[PDB]
Amino acid sequence: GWIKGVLVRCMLNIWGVMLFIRLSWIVGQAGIGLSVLVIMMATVVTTITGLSTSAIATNGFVRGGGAYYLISRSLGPEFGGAIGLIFAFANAVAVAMYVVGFAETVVELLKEHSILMIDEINDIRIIGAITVVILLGISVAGMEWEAKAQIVLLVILLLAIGDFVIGTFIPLESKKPKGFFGYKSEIFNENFGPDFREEETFFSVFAIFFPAATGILAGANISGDLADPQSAIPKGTLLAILITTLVYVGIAVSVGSCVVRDATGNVNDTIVTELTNCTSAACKLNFDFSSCESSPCSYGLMNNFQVMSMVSGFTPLISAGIFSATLSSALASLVSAPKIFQALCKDNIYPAFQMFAKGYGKNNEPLRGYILTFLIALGFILIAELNVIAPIISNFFLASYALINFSVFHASLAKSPGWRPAFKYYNMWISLLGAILCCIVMFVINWWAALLTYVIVLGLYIYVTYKKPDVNWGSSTQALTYLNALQHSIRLSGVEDHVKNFRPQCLVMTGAPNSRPALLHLVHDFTKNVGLMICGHVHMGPRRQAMKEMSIDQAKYQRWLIKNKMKAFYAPVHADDLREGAQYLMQAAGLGRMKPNTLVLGFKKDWLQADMRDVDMYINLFHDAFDIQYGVVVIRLKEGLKQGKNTIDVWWLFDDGGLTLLIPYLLTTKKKWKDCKIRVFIGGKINRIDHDRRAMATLLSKFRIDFSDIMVLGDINTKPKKENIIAFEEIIEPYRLHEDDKEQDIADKMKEDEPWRITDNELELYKTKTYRQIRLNELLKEHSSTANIIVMSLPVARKGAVSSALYMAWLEALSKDLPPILLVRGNHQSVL
Amino acid sequence: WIKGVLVRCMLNIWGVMLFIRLSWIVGQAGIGLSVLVIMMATVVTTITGLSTSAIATNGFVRGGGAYYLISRSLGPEFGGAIGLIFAFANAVAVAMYVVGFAETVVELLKEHSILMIDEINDIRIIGAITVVILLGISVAGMEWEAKAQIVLLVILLLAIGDFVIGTFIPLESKKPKGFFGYKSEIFNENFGPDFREEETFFSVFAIFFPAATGILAGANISGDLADPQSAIPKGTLLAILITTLVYVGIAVSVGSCVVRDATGNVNDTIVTELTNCTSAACKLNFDFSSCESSPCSYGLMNNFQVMSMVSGFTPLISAGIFSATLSSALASLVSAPKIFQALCKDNIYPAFQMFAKGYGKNNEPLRGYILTFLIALGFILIAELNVIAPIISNFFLASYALINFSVFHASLAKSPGWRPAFKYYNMWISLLGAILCCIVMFVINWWAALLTYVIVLGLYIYVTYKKPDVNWGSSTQALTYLNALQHSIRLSGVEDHVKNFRPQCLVMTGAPNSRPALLHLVHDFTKNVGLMICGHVHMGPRRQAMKEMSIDQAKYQRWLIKNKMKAFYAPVHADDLREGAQYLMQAAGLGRMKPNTLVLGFKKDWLQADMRDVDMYINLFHDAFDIQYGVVVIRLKEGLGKNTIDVWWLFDDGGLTLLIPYLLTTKKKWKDCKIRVFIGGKINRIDHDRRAMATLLSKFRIDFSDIMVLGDINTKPKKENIIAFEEIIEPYRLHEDDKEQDIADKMKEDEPWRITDNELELYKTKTYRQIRLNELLKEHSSTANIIVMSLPVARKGAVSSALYMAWLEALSKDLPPILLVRGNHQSVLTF
Ligand SMILES: NS(=O)(=O)c1cc(C(=O)O)c(NCc2ccco2)cc1Cl
Numbered sequence A: 001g002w003i004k005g006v007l008v009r010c011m012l013n014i015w016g017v018m019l020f021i022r023l024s025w026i027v028g029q030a031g032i033g034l035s036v037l038v039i040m041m042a043t044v045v046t047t048i049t050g051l052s053t054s055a056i057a058t059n060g061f062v063r064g065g066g067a068y069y070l071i072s073r074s075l076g077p078e079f080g081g082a083i084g085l086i087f088a089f090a091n092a093v094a095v096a097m098y099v100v101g102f103a104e105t106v107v108e109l110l111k112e113h114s115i116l117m118i119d120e121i122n123d124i125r126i127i128g129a130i131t132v133v134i135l136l137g138i139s140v141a142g143m144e145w146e147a148k149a150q151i152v153l154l155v156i157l158l159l160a161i162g163d164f165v166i167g168t169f170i171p172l173e174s175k176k177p178k179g180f181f182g183y184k185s186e187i188f189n190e191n192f193g194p195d196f197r198e199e200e201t202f203f204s205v206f207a208i209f210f211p212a213a214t215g216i217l218a219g220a221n222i223s224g225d226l227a228d229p230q231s232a233i234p235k236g237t238l239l240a241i242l243i244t245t246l247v248y249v250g251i252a253v254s255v256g257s258c259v260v261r262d263a264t265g266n267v268n269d270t271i272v273t274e275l276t277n278c279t280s281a282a283c284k285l286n287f288d289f290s291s292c293e294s295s296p297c298s299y300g301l302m303n304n305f306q307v308m309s310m311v312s313g314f315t316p317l318i319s320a321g322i323f324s325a326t327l328s329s330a331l332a333s334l335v336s337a338p339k340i341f342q343a344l345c346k347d348n349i350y351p352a353f354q355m356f357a358k359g360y361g362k363n364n365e366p367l368r369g370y371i372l373t374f375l376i377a378l379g380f381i382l383i384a385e386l387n388v389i390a391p392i393i394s395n396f397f398l399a400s401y402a403l404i405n406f407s408v409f410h411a412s413l414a415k416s417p418g419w420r421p422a423f424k425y426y427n428m429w430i431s432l433l434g435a436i437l438c439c440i441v442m443f444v445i446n447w448w449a450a451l452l453t454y455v456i457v458l459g460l461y462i463y464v465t466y467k468k469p470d471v472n473w474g475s476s477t478q479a480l481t482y483l484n485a486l487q488h489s490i491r492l493s494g495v496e497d498h499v500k501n502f503r504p505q506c507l508v509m510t511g512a513p514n515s516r517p518a519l520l521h522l523v524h525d526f527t528k529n530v531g532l533m534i535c536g537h538v539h540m541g542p543r544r545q546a547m548k549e550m551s552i553d554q555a556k557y558q559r560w561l562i563k564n565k566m567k568a569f570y571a572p573v574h575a576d577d578l579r580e581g582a583q584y585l586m587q588a589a590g591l592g593r594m595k596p597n598t599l600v601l602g603f604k605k606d607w608l609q610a611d612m613r614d615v616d617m618y619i620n621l622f623h624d625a626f627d628i629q630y631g632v633v634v635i636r637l638k639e640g641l642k643q644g645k646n647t648i649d650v651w652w653l654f655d656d657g658g659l660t661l662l663i664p665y666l667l668t669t670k671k672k673w674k675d676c677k678i679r680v681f682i683g684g685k686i687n688r689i690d691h692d693r694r695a696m697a698t699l700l701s702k703f704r705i706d707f708s709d710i711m712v713l714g715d716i717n718t719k720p721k722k723e724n725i726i727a728f729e730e731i732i733e734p735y736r737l738h739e740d741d742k743e744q745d746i747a748d749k750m751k752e753d754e755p756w757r758i759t760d761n762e763l764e765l766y767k768t769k770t771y772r773q774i775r776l777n778e779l780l781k782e783h784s785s786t787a788n789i790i791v792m793s794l795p796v797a798r799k800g801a802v803s804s805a806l807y808m809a810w811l812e813a814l815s816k817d818l819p820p821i822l823l824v825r826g827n828h829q830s831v832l
Numbered sequence B: 001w002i003k004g005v006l007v008r009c010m011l012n013i014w015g016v017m018l019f020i021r022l023s024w025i026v027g028q029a030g031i032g033l034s035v036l037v038i039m040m041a042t043v044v045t046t047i048t049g050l051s052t053s054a055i056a057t058n059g060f061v062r063g064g065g066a067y068y069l070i071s072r073s074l075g076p077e078f079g080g081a082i083g084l085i086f087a088f089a090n091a092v093a094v095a096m097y098v099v100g101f102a103e104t105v106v107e108l109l110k111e112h113s114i115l116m117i118d119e120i121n122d123i124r125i126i127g128a129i130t131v132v133i134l135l136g137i138s139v140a141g142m143e144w145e146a147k148a149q150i151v152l153l154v155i156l157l158l159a160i161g162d163f164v165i166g167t168f169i170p171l172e173s174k175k176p177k178g179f180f181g182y183k184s185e186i187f188n189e190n191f192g193p194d195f196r197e198e199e200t201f202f203s204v205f206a207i208f209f210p211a212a213t214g215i216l217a218g219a220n221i222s223g224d225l226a227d228p229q230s231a232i233p234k235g236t237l238l239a240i241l242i243t244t245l246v247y248v249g250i251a252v253s254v255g256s257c258v259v260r261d262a263t264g265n266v267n268d269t270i271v272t273e274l275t276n277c278t279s280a281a282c283k284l285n286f287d288f289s290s291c292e293s294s295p296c297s298y299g300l301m302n303n304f305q306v307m308s309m310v311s312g313f314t315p316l317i318s319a320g321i322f323s324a325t326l327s328s329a330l331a332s333l334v335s336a337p338k339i340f341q342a343l344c345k346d347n348i349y350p351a352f353q354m355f356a357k358g359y360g361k362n363n364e365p366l367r368g369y370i371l372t373f374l375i376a377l378g379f380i381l382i383a384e385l386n387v388i389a390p391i392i393s394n395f396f397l398a399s400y401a402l403i404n405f406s407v408f409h410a411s412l413a414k415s416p417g418w419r420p421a422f423k424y425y426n427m428w429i430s431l432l433g434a435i436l437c438c439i440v441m442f443v444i445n446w447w448a449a450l451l452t453y454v455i456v457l458g459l460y461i462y463v464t465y466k467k468p469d470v471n472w473g474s475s476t477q478a479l480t481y482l483n484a485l486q487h488s489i490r491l492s493g494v495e496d497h498v499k500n501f502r503p504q505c506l507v508m509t510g511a512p513n514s515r516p517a518l519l520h521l522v523h524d525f526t527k528n529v530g531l532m533i534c535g536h537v538h539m540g541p542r543r544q545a546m547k548e549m550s551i552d553q554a555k556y557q558r559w560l561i562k563n564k565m566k567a568f569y570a571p572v573h574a575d576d577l578r579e580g581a582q583y584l585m586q587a588a589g590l591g592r593m594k595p596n597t598l599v600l601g602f603k604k605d606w607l608q609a610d611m612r613d614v615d616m617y618i619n620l621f622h623d624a625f626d627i628q629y630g631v632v633v634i635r636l637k638e639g640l641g642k643n644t645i646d647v648w649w650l651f652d653d654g655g656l657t658l659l660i661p662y663l664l665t666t667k668k669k670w671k672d673c674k675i676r677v678f679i680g681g682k683i684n685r686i687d688h689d690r691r692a693m694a695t696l697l698s699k700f701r702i703d704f705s706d707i708m709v710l711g712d713i714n715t716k717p718k719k720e721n722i723i724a725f726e727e728i729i730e731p732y733r734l735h736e737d738d739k740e741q742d743i744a745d746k747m748k749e750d751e752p753w754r755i756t757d758n759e760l761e762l763y764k765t766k767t768y769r770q771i772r773l774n775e776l777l778k779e780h781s782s783t784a785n786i787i788v789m790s791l792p793v794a795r796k797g798a799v800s801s802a803l804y805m806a807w808l809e810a811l812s813k814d815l816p817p818i819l820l821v822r823g824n825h826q827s828v829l830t831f
């Protein structure tokens, strides 16, 4: 593997302009020990983030290529996106940092040669604009060029830092005008001072140093391909942070022991005999610093930001090295950030940003993404001063690192993916501690900008929480949502008591979900968010071709159920007939306590023109649903289409456990039937109108129906009319067995060859039930004609007590021409 | 309803800070700043009131505990978080009110002549004694809790009436101090902001926020209302409206009545003299000099009896302070232990369970009492007032911020039980309120805010998965049930194609109490990578089936959740085992969580059992294969080199034979694996087949120890094993050649399962292969933790069930735990 390549790229990202152009003021403002402290703290947080991103790279997404899929699925759909935004924005503003550094170095280069000084902020702005022009011109195309240029340039950078540690080794009297002393002992003692002359504090110089150590995420996940991408990249990058920390400590100590804080650029201010009062760094010598305690100093350590780069020997090589380092870091940042934006746009967790992904050229680079990154980077370039801008970039890098640490901690704690340890010091608690320390430290720097950072993080969490995108868990890593669903189902199965909640769970026995859409919508009304709907389908046919047909039907009808705004589980079964497959579904479907407890059938509207064997299976389906204590709900809709305008009439005619009252109430809460007034109809005696009405009203207050009105009807149990019974017997006539007219042997033959014939004996035996059904239909047409939905208790009979033709004729006569009617019968156990 | 809970809420909110500190606050801060402080505290309290109003209007009829309301509406995690924070806030607020009462008592002693010691220590001793007497009243005060509160409210309104009457009554003795009734001349000097001795705008707000607290404690905590859905919103919100405006009124009247600098001395009664005095002190003649140059002792700044100086009949006003403070303390000491015991009974904190127990007429926690009134005395030791007040303010702000953020989070993420339907509620209002609470939480104190942030974050981390690991703790099914709904829908909506294959097992063992080791072995390779459904076919009468199935389901699910098994007990009712297994294979599971493999224990004692049962058990194999399922036949011994998991790969069945050992290895008990993969290949360059199988293994991430290629299969075994097999199958063998044709025909049609001599002659090579494989397993794999071999398979009706089970018994005769695995041709590197 190219541990060499990863090392050189991570180094070149760290070894930028903040590496060696500001450390002079870092040690001049603070001292030796305090600079060592800030370097060590930046090292601690950087190595915690390095261990975190090492845990990202080596395991959990070892096979997975690319940064963003790994950071998303190996962590969580929520956690990856925020990291992407903040770290991309941090790179975008780092571009501004490094071009400002190049610009101020160019200003210093021009100042000595130029006879006059143009506006300094304007000079920095125009030079930075030109540098970003070169940056984009390089970043249009080419990656092997940077892959070689990094190895080309790291040697020159090491030569530059060697020139720093060697320029003091050669002293010179011409170097004495500037306050230069060669590795003297007094300088280190002078510079080991904990609080110093500049008003800025410790956390200020912490911000001034911190972005230099940032950028380690580039080689771990942002880096892609480059031969071996795993199992040795973490060790190489960790070694990179370690060696950068060692060289930072070395150069800080060397510069602190090198040069005194304030200096006078003159041959004067040298005292022949003054051993007392220690005016300069060299107390007995006092070569340079005198009379500049209150006067501004031209070439001071803290007063001049770049004195170490000017007083180092062979300084043109230093000047070239500054350009090389800052341009290399700028190229790295500006090839990173736009592709980060484009990657998050392509994954489209946030469709509001999705159009930024362009892929204009042969490479997938975003042209409009390049323009947007150019604009925002130049916007931060508009601030031509580096001292206050550097904390801003520090804030977003350190915040992104804190989010990475907390994401790694949450991934280790939850371990929804594989997420092996596969690392030394893989501990999640140390990552949590690093994240907390990062949060506090980010706060201490620029409390207002920090508060805006928490605001942005909370807003990102707010957006990603309510909106669940089928991006990474949805594509190629469905194991995450599978395990979440499995864990939630196991948790649900752990509840001890089920008697508290009836929880209406429906098994809709409609074969084709695309067919009968209004009935599926009506079922979805009462089970949308209160219960489980399972749209069963019994596929009969050859068993050899059964499995492929069932699979393709599952795919197609599940796509249909998801496309329409429904929450249904398509469950297909293979059986010889309807009854066997329905038995399969009713006794076996569901997981744990997500098992259907009501059976929902559509009214068989073609029972007149269908074979009576199918009607027998329909009625026996009613009966063996009642055997398993299911609740039968029969829906008869005009399929040529529901609108809620006035009322939803409920006809409480039987105590079925309260299902026929529970379903209408669940209809009201869906905001489609919000403007619908429940008007319960009950059957009581004329003398008992007040008692029944009052008790029923209290019973609804127990169901919390909040009835509009309750009307008691004495019209039931009367002879319906001459016409309606005529129509009923005309409906019966094709299936009626006229045993009176036929001979007894002929009647027995016609009964045995077709046992579904309705006879004259049980027609007169069940006369009162038939008259009750017809009378109820008359009352429905009179009182419930203007109603959105009608709910009544469906009639039942003992198994074999009635012919199937008679039972379906009762169901047809009861619901003849009404609006959508919902005949409900429930198991006798209470639903409260 | 209104007056039942308004009295309690007004007693709670009108506390110690109404009387002694309001004058001081409107002295340090101007009247404009006092109005700003009271108004913005009112904004915070009203936002919390709308949040808790939505919480109460969430659709459950009556919840006893307000914490339990938070729990059933938002969830166990947030419910526990607000419960703990609010309980601690009430516990420390009890100490605050005790310190306030002790302050009034000690400064009344200073009003009198008797003073035992320095007033600072007198605060400590009086606070301790008052904690003792409040314990004496606290244990059982049912008549004091209900009957005395209306009297206390009457006394409090009486006291505020005397305050107004005192504002409207000038007197000569009030003239040396600051007292000028409702005049602009001192309103001019008093309007200005005059902060003194390190005081800031947020510090006076930090001590003022204790006054506007406990809006939940007054009415919502008790949970005894005629209309809990509707009276709770009107009980609190209107109370705030009848509270804070009264506050504002005082903030005006004091600012209009008493001067910012008042000399207690009677010496500086200036004669009517022509002196300018641009300061408002001499606008009316009395100078109030030398109290601003030197330390002062009166005038909204250096005294707190200035409000008592305003009001006549000062015993009545002092009784007003006493009644208000003790009523607030009594409300807090009732609120906190009840919520704390509800936390323990909800089992969110297992270590806290010892606090739950209590005895009495109504069960109350004595452990909670002793801990709260111990930490109260711990805060009594800090006698300094404006240091106690900020930490109670911070903790109440923590409770309110957590409430608002949790309500907003439940509204945002579309939580399952979220239909509040409150008259005027907005989720954005709650979010803004939580943000404002966090900001003003920080600004008043940084270390306290940091400690609160770190403790609530640690609590959130603890309740993430450590508590939902086994027992999440919610006794309400809904927050679980509907939740799984979306997740199963979250599983159903994804287009998995055939890319995602997971081991989804349908174990067929009727009694999970029997064969626990087999269930553990199945759980080993399906713990976190698939679905495991233990299925039971209940045989018996149909009439008593449902109750028997319900009892068995409850018992076996409790057993499966007690032992660390993640399984679903799925019972089906059928006449025979084959029909129930067909039910479970066809229909069990929902969405993408449907069984993919069939797990069958090896039918030991099949020699003793009737051959019809063996025939049905064998027909289970052929039914599973038809529905395209995978069959594993574990012959784990039920009595319970080095550690090794041997894999004999003799057939290409979709890689399940290799997938099962890999899933075994990624477990704690099988961490040491040393997988040895044996394969049968014809005699050739062995290394070719070895490296091809090695590449196929490296696809599976198996980390093999060695692939051994053995060609000793397909040879005649030893004669001992063959005759042993012959004696095994002898009782079930129809010797058609030995006997006559018609006896054989009678025995065949009577017993179709009899194995003929023709089946033995046809399948001689297969039988020899099975018994030779058994010899090879004994020779090569005698010492191993697990053996996994491809399952023998025959076409339907080709072999008798006796011969088939004799093959399965001969193959696995005296071996370690052996799994005979056959899979559908699906899992070709798809996992
Ligand atoms: N309401 S119905 O009688 O016309 C009806 C109709 C159907 C239906 O076929 O849609 C159905 N599904 C079972 C099935 C058979 C073939 C495919 O699915 C069930 C019923 Cl009850």
Ligand SMILES: NS(=O)(=O)c1cc(C(=O)O)c(NCc2ccco2)cc1Cl
Pocket: B508, B509, B510, B511, B514, B536, B537, B538, B539, B577, B600, B601, B602, B603, B604, B617
């Ligand atoms: N693996 S087995 O053949 O010995 C077996 C064994 C059992 C078993 O009895 O545990 C079982 N349960 C079904 C049942 C019927 C009546 C009671 O349970 C099913 C099977 Cl396949």
